[PDB]
């Protein structure tokens, strides 16, 4: 999900990563938008019978 | 960084952001600082 950031990119960053080197914020090419980038919703499904 | 000292290079910390990548492919082995001179031998 590409919502807006409130991250403070400074001019020469570009991204931002998690403790596990994935990245949780990119800079848009085109525009110096900073988006935060959070995992598709998931979870297990547990059936009630 | 903002200084009111002259020497004795004051404690703290500041980081240096990076102002330029320069992508160059040469060789640098010996180094010479080019400063201006106050000339008024
Ligand atoms: C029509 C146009 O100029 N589109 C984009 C512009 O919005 C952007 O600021 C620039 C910088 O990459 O690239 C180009
Ligand atoms: C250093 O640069 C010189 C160029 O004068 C080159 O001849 C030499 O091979 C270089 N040394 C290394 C270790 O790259």
Known sequence: ?49 | TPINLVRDLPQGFSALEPLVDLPIGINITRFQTLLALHRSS
Do not use: H, M, W, Y
């Open chain 1, 1 to 49: 999900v590409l919502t807006e950031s409130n991250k403070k990119f400074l001019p020469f960053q570009q991204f931002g990563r998690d403790i596990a080197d994935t990245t949780d914020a990119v800079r848009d090419p085109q525009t110096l938008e900073i988006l935060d980038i959070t995992p598709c919703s998931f979870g297990g499904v547990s059936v009630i019978t």
